[PDB]
Design a protein around this ligand. Structure first.
Ligand SMILES: *OP(=O)(O)OC[C@H]1O[C@@H](n2cnc3c(N)ncnc32)[C@H](O)[C@@H]1O
Ligand SMILES: Nc1ncnc2c1ncn2[C@@H]1O[C@H](COP(=O)(O)O)[C@@H](O)[C@H]1O
Ligand SMILES: [Mg+2]
Length: 305
């Protein structure tokens, strides 16, 4: 279990997010290390979910491979017979550093980001449901009358939000606003590509028993070639709303696939939003089992006995 990486200056730390520790390898190259930290209600838990970061990294690698014909991604192309350790300072191969990084790290090319959170929704829930009940719209887009809670949209919809610089929160915008923001032609290409990727993964996951209700993509742009690049993490339970397909019912709220046990435990104790909370062991074990189940389900691989 890894909560926080400590590489002792061997690589420059760029930032610790909720879940990832980010290191700079060179001017053009970052190392993303997924830790075993978990958040709920915008707060990180004190203890970790063991191997959560390995599972999510392996899941992300799976999706990048699944989509390799559909879009370029930011992964560094590691040469046959080499590992990420051959691209890093030799000292990171010592067991004390190696164990913090192995199986949970992605070596990626730094790119200029398209300044949008590219959210695509296949089912109406969360903020989209709230807005719809009130106004009959989602990001100003007119919706059909009579949608029920958690119902599939007729087609997946592109519902971008701004990507706010530190110090402020992300605003929901309409596709026309995204066009003013990033350019008409670019915004159309983004929408086309995001809907294409989401639909493909949504259909695949549904056959495996998981409903991906919505997901957040982030895209970079190669300004030489004009190509859009998939960056960040892709289609994990931290970046997407995963629902259990077997229990899925229109006209109801759905349980969080991964975080329901944790959420119920916190709300029952009124600990939501409270700092320094330690999850009880049975909460840890139950939550860990879900990450493993998501992994085995989507990937077809067994984790262990
Ligand atoms: O999830 P997070 O808040 O830790 O992400 C850190 C920041 O890094 C950006 N990101 C993701 N992928 C890239 C690439 N390849 N190049 C440059 N920045 C990248 C995320 O947008 C987030 O702001
Ligand atoms: N950029 C990278 N960062 C971390 N791991 C990688 C990266 N590229 C490939 N891998 C992993 O290295 C192994 C070799 O697979 P591959 O090179 O895609 O045939 C797989 O487990 C990959 O997921
Ligand atoms: Mg999660």
């Amino acid at each position: 279990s890894i909560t926080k990486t400590e590489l002792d200056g061997i690589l420059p730390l760029v930032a610790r997010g909720k879940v990832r520790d980010i290191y700079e390898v060179d001017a053009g190259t970052l190392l993303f290390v997924a830790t075993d930290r978990i958040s709920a209600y915008d707060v990180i838990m004190e203890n970790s979910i063991p191997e959560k970061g390995i599972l999510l990294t392996k899941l992300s690698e799976f999706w990048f491979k699944f989509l390799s014909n559909d879009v370029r991604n930011h992964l560094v192309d590691i040469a046959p017979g080499k590992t990420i350790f051959d691209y890093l300072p030799a000292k990171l191969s010592e067991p004390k550093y190696k164990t913090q990084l192995e199986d949970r790290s992605l070596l990626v090319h730094k790119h200029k980001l398209i300044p949008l959170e590219v959210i695509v929704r296949g089912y109406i829930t969360g903020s989209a449901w709230k807005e719809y009940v009130k106004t009959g719209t989602v990001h100003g887009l007119k919706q059909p009358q009579g949608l029920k809670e958690s119902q599939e949209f007729p087609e997946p919809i592109f519902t971008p939000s701004t990507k706010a610089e530190q110090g402020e929160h992300d605003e929901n915008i309409s596709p026309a606003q995204a066009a003013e923001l990033v350019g008409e032609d670019l915004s159309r290409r983004v929408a086309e590509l995001a809907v294409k990727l989401y639909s493909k993964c949504k259909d695949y996951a549904k056959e495996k028993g998981i409903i991906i209700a919505d997901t957040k993509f982030e895209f970079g742009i190669d300004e030489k070639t004009n190509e859009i690049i998939l960056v960040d993490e892709v289609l994990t339970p931290d970046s997407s709303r995963f629902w259990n397909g077997a229990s899925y019912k229109v006209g109801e709220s759905q349980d969080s696939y991964d975080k329901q046990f944790l959420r119920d435990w916190l709300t029952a104790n009124k600990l939501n939003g409270v700092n320094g909370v330690k999850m009880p062991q049975d909460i840890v074990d139950r939550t860990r089992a879900k990450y493993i189940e998501a992994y085995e389900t989507l990937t077809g691989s067994k984790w262990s006995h």
